[PDB]
Design a protein around this ligand. Structure first.
Ligand SMILES: CCc1cnn2c(NCc3ccc[n+](O)c3)cc(N3CCCC[C@H]3CCO)nc12
Lengths: 288, 70
């Protein structure tokens, strides 16, 4: 669109390149996300652009607002509010020996849950939440980016090891369906990483990721997770670890923190805590 | 080239896995578990007693090995 000028490239994300940009009229600094659309079959439109319309209306303090959508043929720019930093890069920048203040952890988790609860209540999932996707301003606000886009684009069908660390066991074991609980799982893993500065489950592959999870939470079976032994990629030759062990991977977290974390990481997706319930958890009683 | 994970452990076995590059994995005829002779043809080098015990079907290029503890 002639209404914007690309200043510079700020990185590569799941959907491609993101530019820093400036709205010509208003001097509004923006983030512009280029998404390469396939040329499409005559008579057969995608429902991407309609799902995009929906997302364009969502406004909430803890989500990154999609301000505009610029179409070309076979190309699409998504315009967002710009933000000073991402959470991946911020955690890298904390010097070794320093941690994140435990009250900023709490604050960030809280806000992250507010964003997700807002999305979940509108039946919008993220599915690939990760520190790269969480953006901060210098005043204490944290926001979710890329909410809803996986449904918008994304197919029933690389080198994104990074992406595997926040992935749920229901997905990794090849369950037919997933729902909102995959985002609470992600949030679980990210909570640990806020506290410790490092990934809770640092897998090199899908199987290794599963193994890293089983090691900390115990290898599941029908008793702990009903009907898990029927999922396609469950094998009863997995290593046999016992229920963990999870508190040993996490430092800088008290009794309440550990409680909320273990509810975010329950195996059975039907019993894992919900976003609404997590916001009422006593871990947050001493927040504001 | 070939990648070797760190060892990890059960109460009963020790385990590792090994990641074949896309050229080398693409060649293997065998769809199922392999004997020590077979996985030695491929260039996997481990001590003796390592058993190919399972396949994670979503990642067939990953070979999962176990070996009992004392
Ligand atoms: C929603 C678009 C948006 C808005 N701000 N922002 C930021 N701002 C922080 C930043 C990073 C580096 C340099 N500077 O100056 C600022 C980063 C970022 N991403 C970081 C990784 C590359 C893709 C992408 C992830 C998915 O949003 N995306 C965005």
């Amino acid at each position: 669109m002639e209404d914007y000028t690309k200043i510079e490239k700020i990185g590569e994300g799941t959907y491609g390149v993101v530019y820093k940009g400036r709205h010509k009229t208003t001097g509004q600094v923006v983030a512009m996300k280029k998404i390469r659309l396939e040329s499409e079959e005559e008579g057969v439109p995608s429902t991407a652009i309609r799902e995009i319309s929906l997302l364009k209306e969502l406004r909430h303090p803890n989500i990154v607002s999609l301000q505009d959508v610029l179409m070309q043929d076979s190309r699409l720019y998504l315009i967002f509010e710009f933000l000073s930093m991402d959470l991946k890069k911020y955690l890298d920048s904390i010097p070794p020996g320093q941690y994140m203040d435990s009250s900023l952890v709490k604050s960030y988790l809280y806000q992250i849950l507010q964003g997700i609860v807002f999305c979940h209540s509108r039946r919008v999932l993220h599915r690939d939440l990760k520190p790269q996707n969480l953006l901060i301003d210098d005043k204490g606000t944290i926001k979710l980016a890329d909410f809803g886009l996986a449904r918008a684009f994304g197919i029933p069908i690389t080198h994104e090891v990074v992406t595997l660390w926040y992935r749920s066991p229901e997905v990794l074991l090849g369950s037919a369906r997933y729902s909102t609980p995959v985002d609470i799982w992600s949030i679980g893993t990210i909570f640990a990483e806020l506290a410790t500065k490092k990934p809770l489950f640092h897998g090199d592959s899908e199987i290794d990721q599963l193994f890293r999870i089983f090691r900390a939470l115990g290898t599941p079976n029908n008793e702990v997770w009903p009907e898990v032994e029927s999922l396609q990629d469950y094998k009863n030759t997995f290593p046999k670890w016992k229920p963990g062990s999870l508190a040993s991977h996490v430092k800088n977290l008290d009794e309440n923190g550990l409680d909320l974390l273990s509810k975010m990481l329950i195996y059975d997706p039907a019993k894992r805590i919900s976003g609404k319930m997590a916001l009422n958890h006593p871990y947050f009683n001493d927040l504001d | 080239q070939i990648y070797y994970s760190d060892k990890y452990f059960d109460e009963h076995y020790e385990y590792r896995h090994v990641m074949l590059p896309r050229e080398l994995s693409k060649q293997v005829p065998k769809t199922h578990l392999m004997s020590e002779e077979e996985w030695r043809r491929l260039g996997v080098q481990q001590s003796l007693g390592w058993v190919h015990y399972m396949i994670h079907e979503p990642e067939p290029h990953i070979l999962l090995f176990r070996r009992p503890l004392p």
